Amino acid sequence: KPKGALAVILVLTLTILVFWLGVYAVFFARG
Amino acid sequence: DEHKAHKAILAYEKGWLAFSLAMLFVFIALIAYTLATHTAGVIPAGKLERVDPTTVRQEGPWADPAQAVVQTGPNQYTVYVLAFAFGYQPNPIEVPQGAEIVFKITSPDVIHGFHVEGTNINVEVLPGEVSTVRYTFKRPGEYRIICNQYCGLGHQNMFGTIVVKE
Amino acid sequence: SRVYEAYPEKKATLYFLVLGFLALIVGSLFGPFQALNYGNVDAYPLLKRLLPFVQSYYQGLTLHGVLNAIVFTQLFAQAIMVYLPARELNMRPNMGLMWLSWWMAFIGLVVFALPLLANEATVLYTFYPPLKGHWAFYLGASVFVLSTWVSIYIVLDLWRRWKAANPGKVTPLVTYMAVVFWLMWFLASLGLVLEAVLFLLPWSFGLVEGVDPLVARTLFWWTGHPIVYFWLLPAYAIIYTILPKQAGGKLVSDPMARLAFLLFLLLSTPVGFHHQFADPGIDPTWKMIHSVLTLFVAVPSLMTAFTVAASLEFAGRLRGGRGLFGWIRALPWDNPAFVAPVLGLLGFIPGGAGGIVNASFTLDYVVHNTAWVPGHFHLQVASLVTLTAMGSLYWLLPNLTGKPISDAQRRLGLAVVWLWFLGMMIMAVGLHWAGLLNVPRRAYIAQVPDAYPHAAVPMVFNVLAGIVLLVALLLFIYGLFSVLLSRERKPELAEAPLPFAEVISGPEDRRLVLAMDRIGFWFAVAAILVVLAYGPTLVQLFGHLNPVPGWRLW
Ligand code: HAS
Ligand code: HEM
Ligand SMILES: CCCCCCCC/C=C\CCCCCCCC(=O)OC[C@H](O)CO
Ligand SMILES: CCCCCCCC/C=C\CCCCCCCC(=O)OC[C@H](O)CO
Ligand SMILES: CCCCCCCC/C=C\CCCCCCCC(=O)OC[C@H](O)CO
Ligand SMILES: CCCCCCCC/C=C\CCCCCCCC(=O)OC[C@H](O)CO
Ligand SMILES: CCCCCCCC/C=C\CCCCCCCC(=O)OC[C@H](O)CO
Ligand SMILES: CCCCCCCC/C=C\CCCCCCCC(=O)OC[C@H](O)CO
Ligand SMILES: CCCCCCCC/C=C\CCCCCCCC(=O)OC[C@H](O)CO
Ligand SMILES: CCCCCCCC/C=C\CCCCCCCC(=O)OC[C@H](O)CO
Ligand SMILES: CCCCCCCC/C=C\CCCCCCCC(=O)OC[C@H](O)CO
Ligand code: CUA
Ligand SMILES: [O-][O-]
Ligand SMILES: [Cu+2]
């Protein structure tokens, strides 16, 4: 199995989630 | 070897693509939620409201800044704001805390931004058009308005003030 | 040279590349000054001593945006996405047209550059009315961009000539990429051509008194989104079809590569309201529709992330790398043509993450028109696209010129690529963080040094980045000229095949490749999608026009 490619998409997913949920929290804080 | 690697790569790629689609779908649902709440008030009105930028300072609701704040409901105020090179009128904009504020903003010259620091109010102001957004200030105090659309050499010092009274 | 006689397309390709890199050098000169500004340090006095024609921060920013993001990117795209398909097919482009395209771009550039340099069009690379630039800016820019319509003709011609000689064969991979790319661009480009012909040109010539700013921005952003995919896809063509060979492996899937490009053809254009979330007079339902479709345009890059990572992993294992990290270590980190796109791909992770935030309608109110936006796009175009182009020079330049890269020039290239990457990452941190603290973009903030005290920390990152990138830029200029002005010529280097990768083939779906090769049909679907996404709004806007007078505020 492509464990290396999976590691990359894990880093990508975590980054997307941190960015998105982070800004979502800011949006509500400023609402 | 190459056949086996290829098979495994495609199998796990399909799993990734389904996951990524799921994630994007969850974001869409979370956005839809925002649209059903009071926080969506900052989305500009879609309806076209045309005005003439060459007469806005002489006739109509932007002509006298001291009359810009109008009570339009039991707990609602409409505020006629002019964004212009390089400032905002009235200055300050004075509103009660806990009231729904309907900002109606236009420009007599070029495009300006209207970004109220500490809030989600962030709206482009186009000459000839009225930008209408809504917000309720929960905390009293002074809020800065920043022009965040390049409008010429005066852009970086173009600021205004909203005072939210207790 | 007998080489240029047999392959005249090498010389025209070289002219596009060199003109592009010159534009990049000139536009980039302003970069370190801008990064210092975003670090609250004013170095404009120094800049004006060196370049006395520079009248303001904003004239510099206009030059930076136009030269780097419009000129360099277009010229790179025209070089790569004509020359690569031509070499894959082993066919000659219509050379009359190729040279016409170059001269249109060169003349267009000269014509708009004059007013820019004379401080007559300090309106930024978006040129939003009613800010009113000199007619030569709009005319020169229109001619520059229309150069690409010739390129579209050239590649469609190559493809049709090849299909005539090879009835019932599927389009080869690189040529499939280029065909769908150029067809996407044609549809994409209509917004700006309409904006220029109907509004900006008659206005700047004094034929009409005003322009409606809302209709102008709407037409602008019809093109303004897909133009970024126009910038990206030449880099993607290299990353899919050349990089795996440079890495020591193979492309792990031809079909998945074609599928990514097909999705770009369908989804790049009908999404531009994501630049207009903060605009009045556009219905919120239509904003939500574009938001959803923008989240969909992210899918081809999410796909690319896996297809490419798996190809690099395969290369690393072929070269002896074992475990979970060994495959990375085993890759050819001594080759700048490998290193540059790979570093660009790493920075594209946070770049992509920020793009998905931007696309999310209400979340855009947090970040719109703040420093966050430049933080996002420097990761995408100033890092990935630019690095892929810089790396290309270590394989593409010798192929076009016969000029060898010395071991010393190779090492200098590694240094440039790493410093450029690192400087972009540091600046991205400073800009995203400043953006979250409400610092506006497009602002000479160093001239209001007490206005943003909360941003003191990220401002330090911006100063550091300005310094790092200045060094990277100076080393790049030195490196590029050392190659372009070197004496030696080895014609066998110009006659060598391009380093195109082999593909791992499997039982697959030959039917999927056949389905994707229905290009005429997919082009029609793409066009319909644009009609459905833009039509209803544009009908309303055109029936309620409110033109307003122009202004010069510089
Ligand atoms: C080439 C340049 C650009 C690309 C690409 C790009 C992509 C996106 N953007 Fe953007 N952007 C927006 C949304 C997106 C979205 C959803 C994406 C998506 O297409 C991104 C998807 C990408 C990913 C999901 C990343 C995939 C990761 C990969 C492929 C890397 C994998 C790593 C590997 C394989 C390495 C492994 C190797 C090892 C050794 C380990 C929005 C709105 O939704 C705005 C307006 C905001 C506002 O308020 O003004 C915006 C504004 C900008 C502007 C400013 C325009 C202006 O001047 O006003 C520019 C120039 C720009 C450029 C670019 N943008 N963007
Ligand atoms: C030496 C490298 C570079 C540095 C230090 C640099 C720095 C900057 C900074 C700090 C800004 C924000 C300025 C502002 O909002 O007022 C900016 C704007 C910009 N940069 Fe760069 N940059 C560089 C390279 C590039 C390149 C290679 C691209 C394109 C390929 C690019 C495209 C742009 C664009 C499009 C803008 C926005 C212009 C506008 O808002 O009108 N940059 N850059
Ligand atoms: C390396 C180069 C890449 C550049 C990397 C860019 C950095 C931005 C990263 C994450 C954004 C996450 C948003 C951060 C906001 C979190 C704050 C929070 O948790 O919000 C609650 C608070 O109450 C609100 O007021
Ligand atoms: C805050 C916590 C955040 C953490 C969020 C979790 C991140 C999930 C990441 C990637 C999923 C990738 C998809 C996995 C692949 C699916 C399995 C598959 O397809 O494998 C079957 C294969 O055929 C067998 O041989
Ligand atoms: C097979 C597994 C399927 C399960 C997968 C389900 C996805 C769960 C994620 C998000 C749900 C959305 C939650 C919506 C609630 C939003 C509330 C919120 O964020 O509140 C904001 C603020 O505090 C007040 O306005
Ligand atoms: C690596 C990147 C790390 C970045 C770190 C994240 C920075 C985000 C911080 C704050 C955003 C939340 C804003 C909350 C708004 C409150 C402001 C406020 O209350 O001010 C208005 C008024 O003036 C008072 O009376
Ligand atoms: C504030 C932000 C600034 C920090 C930004 C840093 C971002 C991450 C840097 C590099 C990742 C590259 C990972 C891969 C490293 C390759 C080196 C390697 O494995 O080399 C093997 C050896 O040289 C035999 O060739
Ligand atoms: C291998 C490729 C590289 C990809 C990886 C790089 C992406 C960076 C992502 C997240 C860092 C952001 C750090 C999160 C900072 C949280 C903000 C915080 O703590 O803020 C507190 C706030 O003040 C409370 O009100
Ligand atoms: C090989 C050597 C690697 C070098 C990597 C250095 C490590 C990164 C840390 C700091 C960068 C310092 C640059 C910042 C310059 C001064 C910042 C400034 O303007 O000071 C702000 C202060 O808050 C005013 O009150
Ligand atoms: C290879 C390229 C990477 C090279 C990166 C090296 C960056 C320099 C790092 C440390 C020296 C900083 C020490 C000097 C600090 C002076 C700060 C200063 O003068 O700041 C302005 C001040 O705020 C006015 O009021
Ligand atoms: C937006 C919500 C409503 C709209 C819903 C959109 C979501 C559906 C998307 C894709 C379906 C995937 C179907 C792909 C199946 C094709 C099978 C294939 O190609 O795989 C065969 C393999 O090669 C041999 O085993
Ligand atoms: Cu008003 Cu910038
Ligand atoms: O434009 O993203
Ligand atoms: Cu876009």
Residue numbers in the entry:
A (entry chain C): 4 to 34
B (entry chain B): 3 to 168
C (entry chain A): 9 to 562
Which sentences from the paper describe this structure?
The protein consists of 3 subunits: a 61.7 kDa core subunit I with 13 transmembrane α-helices (TMHs), containing heme-b, heme-a3 and CuB; an 18.5 kDa mostly water soluble subunit II (the CuA domain) with one TMH, anchoring it to the lipid membrane and to subunit I; and, specific to ba3 oxidase, a 3.8 kDa subunit IIa forming a single TMH, running parallel to the TMH of subunit II. Toward overcoming this barrier, we applied crystallization in lipidic cubic phase (LCP), also known as in meso crystallization, and obtained highly reproducible crystals of ba3 oxidase diffracting to 1.7–1.8 Å.
The wild type (WT) protein and A120F mutant of ba3 cytochrome c oxidase from T. thermophilus were crystallized in lipidic cubic phase and their structures were refined at 1.8 Å. The A120F mutant was originally designed to block one of the mid-membrane entrances to the oxygen channel, but it has no effect on activity or the spectral properties of the enzyme; however, it demonstrates a slightly better crystallization behavior. Both structures are almost identical (total RMSD ∼0.29 Å), while the A120F mutant has a better defined electron density with lower B-factors; therefore, the subsequent analysis will be focused on the A120F mutant unless noted otherwise. Overall, 20 monoolein molecules were modeled in the asymmetric unit. Another interesting example is OLC7, for which the head group protrudes ∼10 Å above the extracellular side of the membrane surface and forms strong hydrogen bonds with the side chain of Arg141 (2.8 and 3.2 Å) and the carbonyl of Glu144 (2.8 Å) in a pocket in the soluble CuA domain. The asymmetric unit of the current model of ba3-oxidase contains 225 water molecules, of which 53 are buried inside the protein. Refinement was performed in several ways, modeling: (i) a single water, (ii) two waters with partial occupancy, (iii) two O-atoms separated by a fixed distance of 1.47 Å, and (iv) two unrestrained O-atoms.
